[PDB]
Every structure is written in C-alpha cells, then in structure tokens.
C-alpha cells in the first residue's frame, strides 16, 4: 500500500493571524534627527512568524550614521513573534493586521539623551512596512551614543507585554543594556504604547512576555554604513 | 468562553441596520473561534445560512468576519464541515477566489483547505463546486501566502480517491507543481512535494502523468538535500512512484536515483534509514 497526507489548515484566533503563515517581505523606513544630526535608514528582508525569525539589512542612505546601530535595533515588527499554539489568543500584533498599529516609544539613555519614536506598522500590498520617525534630544556629544562608544551587539532578554483596554492597545516597559567598549554598560529605558489603526476587533492579551535573541553582522561587499540583523522571537509566560 | 444569548444573535444577523448586524457578527464569530463544542452551539442556533448569505455582502468588514467565522467552523469535526457544505457556502467560497481583495481571497482559500481536509465526499463537493480551475490559477500567484494556501488546498484534494487525483491532473496542476520543486522557499517546496506525493499514490497512469510532467530529475536532486523533511518527502514520493509497473520503476532507475538510495542506508538518521531500505526493496521485484 501507498501513504497519503491530509490535514486541515486549522483554527485562527484572528483574521490577521493568517497573514503571517509563511515568509512575509519586510520594508523598514526611518527618518532620524538626533541633536540636529539628520539621517535616514532603509531596511529590507523577510519575517517568518512560524519560527519567529527576522532577517534584515539596514543601510544609512544619508551617509554615515550619527548614532550606533545597536541603539536603533528596538525602533527598526513584533507581529513576527512566534506565538505558541496555546497563546494565539494573546497576539495583539497580528490581530491588528492588515490595517496595522501605531507604535510609540520614549527611550531614555541613562545619563545621556532621549529618543522619541512614532511608527506605523502595517501591510502595503504583501509587504509588512514599518515607517518610523525618530527625534533624539539632550545627547552628550562625547557620550556613548554620539561618540560611538558602544560594541556592535544586542543582548538577549524578555520584554513584558500588558494590555491597555482603555486605549484598546498594548503597553511594555523594559530596559536594554548596551555594552560599552571600555567594559561598562549603557542602559536604555523603553516605555512603549501600541494602538490599532483600524476599527476592527483586536486581541487584547493577558500579561506575558516576548523573548528575543539578536545577531548583528556586516555584509562584506557593502561599502555603505549598514547593519545585517538576525532575530529570533518567541512569546511565553502563559500556561495551558 | 460559553455564552447563552446565541438565538438573539442569529436574529440580529438579519438586521437592516449595519451596526447591530456587525456587533452580532463580531460576538458570534469569536464563539466560533473556540472549541468544537462552541462551534456546535452556533450551528444548532442556525447561524450558518445567515453567514452564507453574508458571503455575498458588499461590505468587506462583514464579508471578512463571516468568512473567518466559517473557516473556523470548517476547522471543526467532519459533521461540522458537512453543515457548512449543506448550508451552501461552497459556491460563494469558490466565487471569492476571484476577489480583488487579497485578504478575502486568502480567507476563502483557508476555509477551502479546511473543508477539503474532510472526507472524500466533502473533497468531491469542493471539486463539483469547481474550485480546481481556480486553485491551479493561484499556483502562478506572486503572493507567497496565496501560493501556500492554494498548495495546501490542492494537496488535500489530491489525498482523495484516484478519480479525485485525476480531477487535479486534468486541471493541469502538474506543470505548475514540478516548476515549484526548484523554488527557494522551504515551505512551498514541502507543499509541492506533499501534493505530488499524493498524486503519485494513485493508479499507474496517474503515477506516469507525474513522470511525464518531468518530476523525476527534480526529485533525485532533493535526495542530496540538507533538510531532513524534504529528504524524507523526496523519498516518500520516490517510494509511491516505484509502487507502479515495471515502466514506473525503470523511469526512477533512468533518473539516476539508484546510487542515491544506497547512500541513504549509511545515513545517521533512524527514520530515513528504514524509509530507504523499504524504498529500494520495492524497486527490486
């Protein structure tokens, strides 16, 4: 006898969930101005929410980046987090698609400046786009950020997600520890708010966390100021 | 989880005002997202004909919710897939494969992949609704997601009876399928291997149609794959194709898979070692 495979495509907790079932092309556009130093970044690549894998290459189109690439990692698509089967009802990010969401952040670099960011994460055709505006203020010209004193890496840690039922959104407050070349640590305090763009129903989650692992690299044949970024993200913190 | 104001919701599904219809549809759809016990409660309340009538709604947000609710219902048991078929949802689902809204098309395909994961009579119902000419078209789509759901749908229809396999063959899925064996994306590749393995599990003629489409050289190239799943699948397809006549075995030999099958016996894998010894023994008769 011969063997045959048949299987249902499955249950979907949201309509938007289905839009991340395969590999999805990503486009990232950033418009920066830190202490008056204007810059623009453009990233392209793909996201695979099935495995929680992002692969992107970011290029500074304005020339040399005034800030270190690791300070931009958090700003430069949480919809590509792998939500295990028992947690699919807690995926706000995919549920807000295709119309997308607004992501706002205040990043406070301890004893240095602050980044204010506003981004629109949504589908434009089959491409998931993250279009951002970042404004940086009160930075030390000889600090770890303007003086590029940070190592080219990004530490793996847990971001805790909480609901914002009154704003029909999501909130997250987490710290980032950037390694300084001398041996010290530069802390970056993240305060986040996500709100849907559309008027459709959204999946509001119970408290949980996102575990993320990042690898920063350089393309050998790339003469422009760039960053090749690899990420692995998984949702956890809610039991069966 | 379980509500108790469901009959009033089905009555609100046929409301002349758009807002009280959308509220009833939103709450009723979330109930269908739950367990198989919850899917029964929505069927038993008679929500199905109202949701089917909503598949011809000129509002995209109503259409998208009706369609999402119905695909979750079809993700239930075989009698719940039947309830969807019986409610007449199939012709409306096949018409939605021509939607200019990609999200609605995707939602329609996923609903179809679910229905075609049911019994052979339910697979035939899909064929009769005429989904095959549309799914073969979607195989040329530049949209990776459309291509995945169309291959998942076709792979299910091809797990049916040999006349149902022939329905897929006569719809001309084979050239598009053999083209997809070279594809860079791992998932769509695993799916093309899935659909072809099912077509290759049919009668000797259907096994020959796969060979005639030029599947054999591509399949031999997948035996030298690093991915253990494509390796496993490339040989499932190779074993199924070997189950034919002496002409369906000699075609495999002529492709060059002989020396390739011999090496996969010294492989470190335990599942692939037993799959290889079960494959070459079938080829020597």
Task: Give a verbal description of the structure.
Chain A: Keywords: Chromophore, Luminescence, Photoprotein. Chain A: One of its GO terms (biological process) is generation of precursor metabolites and energy. Chain A: It holds the Pfam family GFP. The complex is a heterodimer of chains A (240) and B (285). With 240 residues, chain A is mainly beta. Chain A is built from one helix and eleven strands, in the order βββαββββββββ. Chain A has one helix at residues 92-95, and strands spanning 24-34, 37-48, 53-60, 101-109, 114-124, 127-137, 157-164, 169-179, 185-196, 208-217, 226-236. Chain A has an eleven-stranded mixed beta barrel with strand order 1-2-3-11-10-7-8-9-4-5-6. In chain A, a hairpin with a 2-residue loop joins strand 1 (24-34) and strand 2. Chain A is globular and about 70 Å long. Chain B has a single domain (1-285), classed as Leucine-rich Repeat Variant (Alpha Horseshoe). Chain B has helices spanning 6-12, 18-32, 36-44, 48-53, 60-73, 78-86, 89-95, 102-115, 120-128, 132-137, 144-157, 162-170, 173-179, 186-199, 204-212, 215-221, 228-242, 246-255, 257-263, 271-283. The longest helix of chain B is centred in the N-terminal third of the chain and has 15 residues, at 18-32. Chain B is elongated, with a radius of gyration of 22 Å. At the A-B interface, loops of A face helix 5, helix 8, helix 11, helix 14 and helix 17 of B.
Q: Topology, pairings included?
A:
The complex is a heterodimer of chains A (240) and B (285).
Chain A: E1 24-34, E2 37-48, E3 53-60, H1 92-95, E4 101-109, E5 114-124, E6 127-137, E7 157-164, E8 169-179, E9 185-196, E10 208-217, E11 226-236
Parallel strand pairs in A: 1-6
Antiparallel strand pairs in A: 1-2, 2-3, 3-11, 4-5, 4-9, 5-6, 7-8, 7-10, 8-9, 10-11
Chain B: H1 6-12, H2 18-32, H3 36-44, H4 48-53, H5 60-73, H6 78-86, H7 89-95, H8 102-115, H9 120-128, H10 132-137, H11 144-157, H12 162-170, H13 173-179, H14 186-199, H15 204-212, H16 215-221, H17 228-242, H18 246-255, H19 257-263, H20 271-283
Helix pairs in contact in B: 1-2, 2-5, 5-8, 8-11, 11-14, 14-17, 17-20
